[PDB]
Each structure stands twice: as structure tokens, then as C-alpha cells.
A paper describes a structure:
The short-chain dehydrogenase/reductase family, consisting of 60,000 documented enzymes, carry out the catalysis of oxidation/reduction reactions using either nicotinamide adenine dinucleotide (NADH) or nicotinamide adenine dinucleotide phosphate (NADPH) as a co-factor. SDR families share several standard features, despite sharing low sequence similarities (less than 30%), including the Rossman fold domain and the active site, consisting of a highly conserved tyrosine, lysine, serine, and often an asparagine.
During protein purification, the purity at each step was assessed by SDS-PAGE, and the sharp elution peak from the size exclusion column corresponded to a molecular weight of about 100 kDa, suggesting the enzyme was a tetramer (27 kDa protomer). After structural elucidation it was discovered that Gln69 was missing, and investigation revealed this error was introduced in the original design of the plasmid. Fortunately, overlay of the experimentally determined structure with the Gln69 deletion and the alpha fold prediction without the Gln69 deletion showed that the overall structure was not affected, and it overlayed perfectly with previously determined SDR structures. The structure presented in this study presented no evidence of the cofactor (or substrate) bound in the well described binding pocket. All four catalytic residues, previously characterised to have catalytic function in SDRs, are conserved in the SDR structure determined in this study (Asn108, Ser136, Tyr150, Lys153). In further support that NADH is more likely to be the cofactor rather than NADPH, superposition revealed a clash between the phosphate of NADPH and the loop between 38DIDAK42.
Residue numbers in the entry:
A (entry chain B), B (entry chain A), C (entry chain B), D (entry chain A): 1 to 260
């Protein structure tokens, strides 16, 4: 996976997550400069890890003013933007117990802000004929007990990816979505006691490949879809879930014999 | 379609539309008492045509207080609710031009308010072990130029229908969705000049059956899903789109010959 | 579910299964005469159960001559056919171990014969402006370990339903598919020891409604789609699986806590 | 797209097509040795252009003996196979007019032969822990007037891809599918008069990106899925259709205005 994006500029929302850092590293390795927009402070450290190749801009994407200031800063330090990766999300989700206020907050962060960040960067993507990668999940294709806000948000992101693709094609912008499964996480790392083999064995029940996915494995699909190798891919959902979404409630274990 | 729902109480949000009127008539004909919730005053007239069997309650479903008051009125005049048909929606939609405020408004009306209305009625549906029908669209499965808010809202309703089904099954409540295509509507009647054969001529290009759907044809599917005949149907999306969703950009006309 | 199909004639392939008998009973109750086409001899008993309302014609649907003779017999004893329910299938399936010969046999029985039986009845369905119901499964939407021939066959039936819908619409014929989950079966009845409560508790892990489906519950959806209440439903897949298809490998039980 | 597959051996059925040629070139450029299996003699010329790195073996994949001999020749000249690209297909397709014999022939070539070729190569892919790429189409997700056999065959390939992924995961073999839209082809070049801009003008109505796809653009996705960058991708369908599959019968042009 030796793609060449020398001189290009990329924007990565929610770049403080392990997937976010893998996406940033993938872009830097390809020669691109990256601006990380996130509310989490840890992002700063990530940016410093790449010295002048990556810049961190703490941004509340629900604030239009914060987005305008972030794009101004990107223009001042890096230049015109070619790639946008919308990875920002909130895990505010208590199913039926979540309130109307929680619903609107989660939708604003997970969905509406993707529109506003794309809009603030649209003229750049138009001039550069760039590409956009949004993030769905296996949760956008299936129901999970007790989780409403994030699955519904991600299903909505899927449709938004299609509509953006259609209405952005005229300007030469490609828009796709990436649908991962269980990926090694900071949260999983802490609840598991930083024990990867056990977390993998738990995940084996829901992934044909028998483990959690690596952030790098997700980042590869992001970079492919951004690159010109995917020049005839727009509006598509690229699954990187180790086979999660081909299975139903029976999993990968026989079910008929239980009847006897 | 001669189902018996004698004595059962149904609530139909967005009941002032042609679809809503057809659903109300289908329910009354089946012996049910109906509460019409809508922000449109036309609903009043509709209810009056059915004398004491149908009630109208002008409701802004974005107001929690309005929902509590609507449920109180239903309790006073009709009683415990068995069926909920979430048909309320807004067509506030300017594609990419729609603002953040427009996004959150359309999501509040189309999606979050469905949750709040379901929550206010949940104890009724649990005691009665009733059923819920949400409304998706052909717009939740495909992209349409210049339309973002309503397609995305309906794509979100589809996932919400699945997650509602899962977390409500334990209480014996079924939840499904209905996906109609182009159906005869007030707006189409106004742009058509109240010319149905002309509008049918336009819609033939997008429906295998060569016309717009009738509101009653949609109401039939709604009624089936509410009834006990659908007693093993939960979390499903039932299309009533005259073949719209089986087609792609080629429509129903051959396309290869055009290359010669 | 009191539909009126007086005087109509229906053909039910594979009518010897419990689902088949439920579909036949549903049609008879609606006033229709039914011809059961099947290779299984038990069908004869089923037909006798309805005296002169149902006729049995032992038919090898892989034999074109047998199909022509069956349609001749239907015309001699019953008349012009209005409804066709393609329920015939084989469970010849050993996954990767199944041979090319097994593959072609299973595809011939499960798929190609549906085309030939529709073709032999096409002029009837055209004159009567009838409807067709094919049978998919939850197996057409997901992968199941060790089962290739039947899932692939059913996925192919799904696409065939769409293509038939498109190319039959001009003649006023509607074509849909029904997708059930685990339904109480003869095979399940024998391996379970005719113990329904235990089989239901096994199935609860894969159906939100916590049991196997009843054949009658599937038959209701078949009859709806055949009837004129579904007059704007063509090319659609109507799930009657108690919520099986809304779930993934996590089932309906929490999965995050296992990580701790 | 600078992947390193040095020393690895790939097999490409149906390699005489433009897609196949692009995939062969992509693999060779990545350092792989390629075996071209096809019934078309044009493949011979293709292989000769790459001297000793690419081999051509004229094969009727419906003949088990031919497959065994093709694997023997691959073993003699190149060695153990790591990658399999199932691209062989027939366009024998007359919709409803196609006979039972035509159905079984098209299914044998398009679908069952994929299984037999995978089975003959399975021990290789298991030892090498390789990957398989099947070919679906935009025709597996939608209905097209007058075309049954190929759309249904491809819909079946989609499910076969999922079931292969599941039952091959234990052996470390990934299996995915690629779904292209209208791609430049020999047949289009013949009906077009070798006029690419004209054919692009026709295809713009069915692809957001306003043209036919290039064979190389499809080959890029094939190569990504074969490579270790897709190491958490199994059982997925990767669309490379220029936005075809996000559209319905309305295409990318507004349709509501037509009603006025």
C-alpha cells in the first residue's frame, strides 16, 4: 500500500481515536499533510508525533465559528484541502432511555456537523477535485440491544454518503463510506486490561477472521478510497469488518443441531 | 382486507395527509377508534366525518408538553392505545443548501419526535401488546438530486424501526416500517392541476405498474402490519412502491441499444 | 384476514410442506380452488382433506412434460389459473462438499423450474391479471456455516423475483417474494420429538419474537401479496421471520460486557 | 497502487476480456505470476506480451477434467496458487425467452464452475492462505428489462461469496466480490464504432461520474482485495460502478418538476 499523495492536504475529524491516528499515519506515509480536528486534547500529542507534517486544531464541530476558524488556520499553515475524512462521532447512547435532547445532540455531532465541515471545505474540494470518506459501521446495517443513537446516526450517515456523492459528482468530488466492525479501541484496551488476546477471542464469535480489526486495516481502506486508484468508486460502502456483516444471529456456529 | 380491530384504539401522527386519511379510514372500517395527531388543521375536518369514532388533536410533536397533553386527551375520550402509526414528517429539504438549523429541525420532526411519541404511549402498547408502523420511503434506499434531509431522515427511520423492534420484542410489541413510492398527494394534485392521468403518465417511468400509488394501497399494508395476521412480522420494511425500488438509473426501458 | 377469492384458481408448488398446507388452507378459506403440484406423495392426503376444493397432481417440476400435463389437468378439472405460489425446493445441500452435479440438480429444482412453471401458466396469469409469490428465506440475506446450495438458490430466487416483476408488469402480473425464518417444520417436529416448547426456546436465540414461526403466519403474508389489497406491491421481499434478519452475529444479547 | 506480490501466483478465469487484461497487468506490475484461464483464444496473445511471467491455458471450466489439467499445468510452469480471480462468465441471456437448457448452461458457467475451480485450487489457497475475488455486477442489485440469466447468476455469486468467506475463514482464506457498472468492453467498442466519448455520453445518464468505467479502475479494486492491505476484508462486496448503484429510476436528473 504505497500510495503517493505528495503535497496534498487532508483533514481528519475525530483524529484522536486509534482509527484516527492510523488514518493520519497512513496519510503522512503517503506524503500528505494532515489537519486533525477534534475536541479531545490527546490529538495534540498525535500531531506532535509527526512534527510539521501534522497540525492539531481543537475544534467543536457543532460550532460553525469553530469550523470557520479551523479552515482559516488550515489555509494559513497548510493550504488548500484535497481530502476529508469524517470520523468524528459521539457514543452518547442509552437506547430508549436517551432523551430528545440527547438525540439532537448526538445527531448534531455525528451527522449535521459532517455537512457543515464539508460545506466549509467545499470550495477547496471543488478546486482540488478531492475525495471524502465518511464512516458508517456494522451498527448501521443491524440492530444491537440498547443502542439507538449511534446505529441510527450511522445509518443516516450511509444515506448522506449517497446523497453527497450524487450532488458532488458534478464538481468532480467522490464521496464514499467505510464500515468497520469491532476494531481495537482505547475503551476496549482499558476494559480488557490491555489484554488483546482475550479481547480477540471474545470478538471471534462475531468476525469470521477471529479477532478484532486493527486500526491500520481500517486506515488502508480509507486511503484506498481517497486515492486515485478508487477513481471510479463513489457513493459506495466499503466494509472492513472481517466478515461481521455476512452473519446473522446464528453467528458462525451450527444452529440446526441444537434442535435435537 | 376485512380485519376486525373492534374496540382497539389507534393513533396516527400526520393524519391530515392523503396517506393518513386512507389509514384512518382503513382503521375505522376495521372497527378501531382513531386519534389523529397533526399540526395541520385539515385533520379536524377528517375526524368530524367519522363522528365519535375518530378524534383530532392538533399537536406539535416537537413539544414534549404537547405530547403529554395529546396522550391525556386520548385517554379521556378513547382510552388505552393499541396501535401507533408514525406518519408525521416535514419536507423542509434544500439538499446541500439546507442549514444546520434546518437539519436539526427536520430531524426533530421526522425522527426524534417518533421516539418521544412512542415513549409517551409505551405503557399503553406494552399493556395492550400492540404494534407500531413507521414510514420509510423509496428515498431511504436511493439518492435523489437536491434532496438530503428527507432521504436521510427516512434512512434513519429504517434503522430506528429495527432497533425499536429489538428492544420492544420482550414486551410483545411489534415494530415495522412501510416504504411507499410516488403516491397521489395534495402537492402532486396541486402541481398536476388535479389531473391524475397526467401525473400517472409521468410516474410510469419510475413504477413498474405504470402509475402513482393510491393512498388506500399504502393504507392496506399499514393495516396488515398492525393486525394480528402479521404476528410473526417485526423489524421488517414492507415496500408498497409499485416496483420503484427494483429499478436503477436505466428505469424499465432498455439501455444497451442506446450505445449503437 | 378475511380475503375473498371466490372462483379463482391457485397453483401451489411444493404444497406438501407444513407451510404449503397452510397456504392451501388460506386459499381455500378465501374461496379459491387450489392445485397442489409436488413430488411428495403426502400431498394427496392434503388434497383429500379439502375434498373437491383442492386437487393433487404429482409432478416432477424438472420435467417439462410433467408440467404441461399438470397444466392440462388443471385446465380440465379447475380452469384458468390466477395465482401461483412457487414453494417447491430441495434441501440437497452439503456446502463445499456438494458436487457440480448436486449444484445443477438443486438449481434446476429450486430456481429453473420456477421459470418453467411460470411459463407454462403465463397465458393464464396474463388473461387473469394474476399474481405470483416466490419464496426466499433469511438464508438469502446471510451466510450459514455448511449450507451453500439452498442459500445461493434463494438469493437467486430473490433476484429472479425482481426481474419477473419488471418483465411481467406490462401484462398486469405482480411478482413478489416471501422471506420466512425458522418455521415449525416436519423435520424439526421429528428431530425435536414433536416437542414444540423446546424447539421454540432454541429458536428464541435467533428470533426477536422468541419462538419458531407458525406456518399460518407465513401463509397470511402469501395471501396478502396474492390479494388485490397488495395491488401496488410488486417486486418486493416481505419478511416474515420474527425479526431474524434485523440481527447480526451478536444476536439479541449484549456483547460489549463480554469484553470485561 | 504499488503493492508487492513478488513470487505469488494468481489465476484469472475469463482473462481474455478487457477487465481480465487489466487485472492481469495489475498483477504482473505488482510482481505476481499469472495464469490466464479462458475459453477465448485471445487470451493467448495477452499472455505472450508478458513473456514467461504470464501463462495461457485454454480451459472449458464446465469440464472437470479441463480444470484438473489446468491446475496441473499451473503447477508445472508457475507453482502453488495464492490468488484466484473468478471473472469467467457468459452473456447467454434472453430473459423470459431463455429455455431451461439455457438457464442451466448459464448457471454452470457463471456460478457452479466458480465452485469447481475454487475446489481444485483449494489446497493451494489453504497452504498459501490466499484470497479469492468473485465478480458480481450492478445487475445483481437491480432488475433490467429482458435480462434474467446474468443478473440472477450474479445475485447468486454474491451469496456464494458470503458463504465461501464463512466456510473458508477457518483456513485463513479471504473471499470478496467486486461489483462494476458499465465498463469499457469489447462489445461496447463494437457497437460504439470504437467511439469512447460517444459511449461515455450514453453512460453519463447511469453513472454519477459521467462516463463508463475503465477496466483499470476495476482492476485496482480487484488488486486491493487480493493484497494484504485488505487483511480484515472478507465476505464483502466492493462496488466500482461510478455511482450507478446509488440511483433509482429517476437517475441523476430531477423528476418532481415533470409533474407540473
Amino acid at each position: 500500500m504505497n500510495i503517493d499523495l505528495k503535497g496534498k492536504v487532508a483533514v481528519v475529524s475525530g483524529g484522536a481515536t486509534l482509527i484516527g491516528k492510523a488514518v493520519v499515519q497512513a496519510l503522512v506515509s503517503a506524503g500528505a499533510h494532515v489537519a486533525i480536528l477534534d475536541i479531545d486534547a490527546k490529538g495534540k500529542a498525535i500531531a506532535e508525533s509527526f512534527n510539521h507534517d501534522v497540525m492539531f486544531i481543537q475544534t467543536d464541530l457543532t460550532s460553525d465559528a469553530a469550523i470557520q476558524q479551523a479552515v482559516a488556520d488550515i489555509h494559513q499553515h497548510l493550504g488548500e484541502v484535497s481530502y476529508l475524512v469524517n470520523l468524528a462521532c459521539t457514543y452518547l447512547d442509552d437506547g430508549f432511555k436517551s432523551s430528545r435532547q440527547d438525540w439532537l445532540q448526538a445527531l448534531d455531532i455525528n451527522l449535521v456537523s459532517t455537512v457543515e465541515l464539508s460545506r466549509a471545505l467545499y470550495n477547496d474540494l471543488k478546486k482540488q477535485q478531492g475525495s471524502i470518506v465518511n464512516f458508517t459501521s456494522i451498527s448501521a446495517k443491524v440492530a444491537q440491544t440498547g443502542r439507538w443513537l449511534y446505529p441510527v446516526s450511522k445509518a443516516a450517515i450511509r444515506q448522506l454518503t449517497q446523497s453527497m456523492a450524487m450532488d458532488f459528482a458534478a464538481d468532480g468530488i467522490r464521496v464514499n463510506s467505510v464500515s468497520p466492525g469491532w476494531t481495537w479501541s482505547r475503551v476496549i484496551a482499558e476494559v480488557s486490561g490491555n489484554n488483546r488476546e482475550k479481547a480477540d477471542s471474545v470478538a471471534a464469535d462475531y468476525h469470521l477472521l477471529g479477532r478484532l480489526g486493527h486500526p491500520e486495516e481500517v486506515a488502508n481502506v480509507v486511503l484506498f478510497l481517497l486515492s486515485s486508484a478508487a477513481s471510479f468508486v463513489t457513493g459506495a460502502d466499503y466494509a472492513v469488518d472481517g466478515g461481521y456483516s455476512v452473519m446473522g444471529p446464528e453467528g458462525l456456529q451450527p444452529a440446526i443441531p441444537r434442535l435435537a
